[PDB]
């Protein structure tokens, strides 16, 4: 009611660079090219979300419906600017995302959560808990799959479901 609440929308291609800058300043996230973020704004925007505060992007979530089993939504990246941690933005993006019309008929959410990303661990398990949906945590990608120089963590798989996301 005073122009300082966080607002949520689908991205567009022209957001790509501002999304890229958010992911870049996070430091801790796996940065894709600016082009990749434009394509997500262009072709995957039905299953992605941006959070903004006072003209700045402060949050992003990317996801897609799995091409082979489109009842599975894969959540790719969740980012929240440093300056806006601990305000429920991640939970609000995820919740908003699942209420999008393009998530109709999703029965499982899959994602990968780095050991160090404790906020996401809480977001996904918390989501499932709150809606009383089963959750399963298993081996995802191991550290050793990543390039020799790099020093990447494991990416354990989190599966939420089965449930039925009705529109």
Ligand X SMILES: CC(=O)NCC[C@H](N)C(=O)O
Per the annotation, where are the binding residues for CoA? 78, 80, 86, 88, 90-91, 117, 122
Measure CA 129 to chain center.
18
Identified binder of its own copies from the candidate list 35, 82, 118, 136, rule CB under 8 A: 35
Per rule CB under 6 A, is residue 78 in the interface with ligand X? yes
Q: How far apart are CA 152 and CA 122, in angstroms?
A: 21
Q: How far apart are CA 7 and CA 106, in angstroms?
A: 24
* Residue 71 interacting partner from its own copies, ligand X, none (CB closer than 5 to 8 Å by kind): none
| Residue list 118-147, contact with ligand X (CB under 6 A) | 120
110 in Cβ contact with 74 (< 8 Å): yes
Q: Supply the minimum distance, in Å, between the C-beta of residue 148 and its own copies.
A: 8
Beta strands in 11-154 (DSSP E): 49-53, 56-65, 72-80, 108-112, 135-141
Identified binder of its own copies from the candidate list 6, 8, 10, 17, rule CB under 8 A: 17
Tell me the chain's radius of gyration from C-alpha atoms: 15
Output helix, strand, coil percentages for the chain, rounded to the nearest 5.
Answer: 35, 25, 40
Number of residues lying near ligand X (CB under 6 A): 14
Per rule CB under 8 A, is residue 16 in the interface with its own copies? yes
Binding site for its own copies (CB under 8 A): 13-14, 16-17, 20-21, 30-36, 38-39, 43-44, 46-47, 64-68, 74, 76, 102, 141, 145-147, 150, 152, 155
């Amino acid at each position: 009611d005073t122009g300082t609440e966080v607002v949520y929308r689908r991205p567009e291609a022209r957001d790509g660079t501002r999304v890229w800058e958010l992911i870049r300043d996070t430091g801790s996230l796996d940065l894709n090219s600016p082009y990749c973020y434009m394509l997500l704004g262009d072709y995957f925007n039905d299953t992605c979300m941006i959070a903004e505060h006072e003209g700045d992007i402060v949050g992003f979530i990317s996801a897609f419906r799995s091409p082979r089993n489109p009842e599975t939504l894969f959540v790719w990246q969740v980012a929240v600017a440093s300056s806006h941690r601990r305000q429920g933005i991640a939970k609000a993006m995820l919740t908003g995302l699942m209420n999008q019309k393009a998530c109709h008929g999703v029965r499982f959410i899959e994602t990968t959560v780095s050991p160090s990303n404790m906020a996401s661990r809480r977001l996904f398990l918390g989501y499932a808990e709150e809606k009383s949906i089963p959750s399963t945590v298993t081996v995802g990608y191991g550290a050793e799959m990543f390039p020799d120089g790099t020093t990447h963590e494991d990416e354990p798989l989190f599966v939420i479901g089965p449930f039925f996301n009705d529109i």
